Ligand binder design. Structure first.
Ligand SMILES: Nc1ncnc2c1ncn2[C@@H]1O[C@H](COP(=O)(O)OP(=O)(O)O)[C@@H](O)[C@H]1O
Lengths: 68, 56, 68
RNA sequence: GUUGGGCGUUGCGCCAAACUCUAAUUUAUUGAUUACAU
DNA sequence: AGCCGCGGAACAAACTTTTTGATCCGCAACCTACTGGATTGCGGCTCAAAAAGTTTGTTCCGCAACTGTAAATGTAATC
């Protein structure tokens, strides 16, 4: 929601299948979804391995231009 | 290619002909040199900058 | 688990400290607590404000590498 | 992939049928409801 | 609703590993016999100098479970 280039996105990855492929033009936002899967995978790894209880987060430059 | 490490390091040479051969056959499109050229070319056109220093 | 529980004193109330580090997993058997030492540092920080030239203690250690 | 019916080597196996806006219900010593003991 | 120590990070001076722009010195060339001047020229080898690439000491950023007088409650199901 109001990430880099997507206003509102909902996706569901298959569980009986072990491979999902993102296909699109250069400038649609397939890299954005992977960058959104991280910053949460970092948090999961941090709380599964370390005691830090810290990780990544949404920076000011990643806010959608105009939103808050 | 282009990242913060080149733009944030912006803060002269007259761009002679013998320059552009420099750092050409290396293997990277150095955006830092292009940004410096952009700045140098457009600077050809202080109180506000001093105000920015004082307010900071 | 591993814990160092040295206790300090300043001619009065005891100011404790526990330095602990446990492997992930067995995590509840030893935890650190820096309450007293933080309080003592706050005391000296306040002392430097009320009296700019206030006396501070000396802390130093010397291994064998002094003259080698 | 999901929903309702039927039989009984019944904390569910089988049979017989259906539906696809891109896309599945979880909280008690609480409050509302069904029910027994009052 | 407040914010513990822990560990990455965003920055920023120091080391540290090469990119470059001369300088040199064999080293075969002339020239003629051969040190031919009173010569050039030409390609490996080396030089610090400086624009690039790590490495390391400091400063904030975030986050969890529950708090001081305090409910055992026959069955199922809701937020
Ligand atoms: N602050 C912003 N405002 C508007 N658009 C943004 C902003 N930040 C990111 N974007 C969009 O995010 C896109 C980047 O695409 P990207 O995530 O790299 O996917 P891909 O690499 O597959 O092209 C760009 O099209 C850009 O417009």
């Amino acid at each position: 929601e109001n990430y880099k280039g997507f206003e509102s996105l909902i996706m569901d990855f298959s569980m009986k299948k072990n491979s999902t492929i993102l296909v699109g033009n250069n400038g649609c936002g397939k890299s954005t979804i992977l960058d959104a899967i991280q910053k949460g995978l970092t948090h999961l790894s941090s709380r599964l391995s370390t005691r830090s209880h810290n990780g990544d987060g949404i920076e000011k430059h990643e806010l959608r231009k105009g939103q808050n | 290619d282009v990242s913060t490490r080149d733009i944030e390091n912006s803060e002269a040479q007259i761009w002679d002909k013998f320059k552009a051969y420099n750092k050409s056959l290396t293997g990277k499109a150095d955006f830092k040199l292009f940004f410096r050229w952009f700045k140098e070319l457009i600077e050809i056109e202080t109180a506000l900058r001093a105000e920015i220093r004082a307010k900071e | 688990y591993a814990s160092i529980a040295i206790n300090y004193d300043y001619m009065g109330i005891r100011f404790p400290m526990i330095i602990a580090t446990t492997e992930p997993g067995y995590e509840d058997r030893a935890k650190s607590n820096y309450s007293g030492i933080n309080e003592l540092g706050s005391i000296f920080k306040t002392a430097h404000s009320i009296n700019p030239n206030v006396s501070f203690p000396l802390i130093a250690m010397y291994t064998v590498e002094r003259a080698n």
